[PDB]
Design a protein around this nucleic acid. Sequence first.
DNA 1: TTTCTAATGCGATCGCATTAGATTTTGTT
Length: 752
Amino acid sequence: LGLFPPTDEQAAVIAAPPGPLVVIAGAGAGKTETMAARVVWLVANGFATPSQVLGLTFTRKAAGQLLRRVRTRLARLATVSTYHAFAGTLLREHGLLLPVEPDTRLLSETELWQLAYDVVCAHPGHLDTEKTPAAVTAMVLRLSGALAEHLVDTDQLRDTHVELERLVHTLPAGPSQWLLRMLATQTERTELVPLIDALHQRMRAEKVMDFGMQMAAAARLAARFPQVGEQLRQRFRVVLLDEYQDTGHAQRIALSSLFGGGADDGLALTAVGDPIQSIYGWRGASLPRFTTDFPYGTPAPTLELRTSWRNPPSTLHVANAVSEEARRVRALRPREPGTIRCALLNNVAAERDWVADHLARAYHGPTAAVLVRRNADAAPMAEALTARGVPVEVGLLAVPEVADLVAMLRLIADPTAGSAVMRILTGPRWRFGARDIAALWRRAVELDLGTADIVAQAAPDADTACVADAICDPGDAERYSPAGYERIVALGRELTMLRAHLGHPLPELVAEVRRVLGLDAEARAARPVAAGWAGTENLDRFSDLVSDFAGASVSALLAYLDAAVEVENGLAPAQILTVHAAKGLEWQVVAVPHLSARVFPSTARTWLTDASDLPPLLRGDRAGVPVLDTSDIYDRKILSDKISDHKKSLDQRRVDEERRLLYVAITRAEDTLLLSGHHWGATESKPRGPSEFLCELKTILEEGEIEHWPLRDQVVEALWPDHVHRGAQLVAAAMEGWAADVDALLAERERP
DNA sequence: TTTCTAATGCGATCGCATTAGATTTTGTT
Ligand code: SF4
Ligand SMILES: [Mg+2]
């Protein structure tokens, strides 16, 4: 009645009776269109209202897609949000049984690093560590985000190296010195326990929290107080747990305590997901238990969705040959055969020319993409594709309109940042030449032996002969070019105007440096004609992050913009996307270009060779994640064999989550699919061989493969130091509503 | 003026000097 016909296998998902129910929805099978097809059957045929619908996904986009596919149906015939927004609401209502304060602020990944580095550099003690601060606060932030993901709380972690150190110093076969290092990493978790515990005593003293503590608190309000769960169960009568294969441990005992731990059988609960696209489990660190954790005391049912819609055959002969014999539920089926083209070339740039030529002979002769494992690898491929004659799509503080705004702001606060003086003296406004830069250094020296003398400097007061106090004192014009002396007086008169504004608020500097600079008039003149009036998106994204910050503009806002270049890779601004980047996007032409060794399989620090990894005795996934025995170990050559076999079991498990990146990057196909992998890398004396996946797939397609069958050491350079010149003649010669607007603007300027 | 890991391949199970790469990345009010 107004839509397409429902499939006969999808009807069991739709017309299932109320109760818990698990669906194994495979790849490309359109799971959302049969999540919304159960909301409609549970509204028009009774059993619920529109207001009693709850859906929970991870990403904020794939909740908005499900938000509309319910309301489009229910208007043709109403509460969808993420997991981490359902935690912040579950602590604004019930968040006083467990004593947290309401209206608690949430720290950014940068403003958390500001606070974590300040409790490491204020620790009274010894620490016995060969590391530096800013490298023992990358272990504090990595255990205390992994202790609050398995719900551990710092007391199960003390004295876990005992009954392992007793195994090496006893049992007389020295202790081989590979086994002391493994013993020295585990007396280092215990050593840093008072750092990841005086950090929580300060985040509770200022009432500010994180994302790994939202779900850690909301899952300790779940299983502890039954009353909070009962109110939620009454409010929502149908609950939709989409993407359940990526649900962590802390998110698992917060849903299985609220929504049906065997409690209610009138609630329509449905949870979808396949075990074989579990790519994200190295971050969340996570379904087989479903039907054992959401029971009636009978176990829960199980159904399947194996018809694949946006995927041709022969990408289901390759994807089913990769996934089977290692992992596999049951194989999925199609409903013309899309082609496969495999290749192997003796150079990266040759293999960047093979994948470009098949992508250029389908554009000048469709929806195309490139799926790469490494973020860095993108750039070269992009340039190559662009160069043939194809248009190509691919940090905020590296944008050249904000970078200039970051650079001339710093030169106002401290005149010892010389690396932001050569951003300005060599920039497009006031282009200096190499003779005037070197004439300013020689003035900057004119304005300026034993252990005590050597340590006298490296102070916060010592004078270092910097350039920026030779612009405010340039001398006489016999040292400079005659056109370059008018610019030193101009930039010295401009800075003294701006340096008197450090008493003003932090935002009104940034709005006055923006006016005095030629910004937001030269940023709009570098955009094409058909783009519109749009020039200042991410130059106005910056100027709301400076006001949401406030602040002192010298220590604050300049040592905040330096952590945020390190910690979160610039900031967030306003196809050659990576393989994690597209998980729900299907194109026509999909190329997976680099399948060499040490690249696509990407080989790795286990729990026994670094501090931060949590020992598998103590995590909530333990028997996967094989925990070692150490009971029959009555020797010391056994202990170097009962552990080295355990490391190879934790390292083969690393490889089984790389086939899942084949099975999730092959089934995004819908058409022809490209596969390649090079033979010489870029900087290797010995060439990198193709990975197992590519030599394995050449044994699948051989039962069409293109002709596969001392490195590249060339130099890349640059030289330092037109319609603009042509368009300047038109304005020189003369000197949509553009006539009356100028008459409006010249009124206010000419009216005192 | 410059760091650190887990490798590799000679020796006298192991020490012991020499050299390649540095991931991927959601989530509030
Ligand atoms: S030219 Fe290259 S090597 Fe020289 S300073 Fe610039 S980035 Fe560094
Ligand atoms: Mg020296």
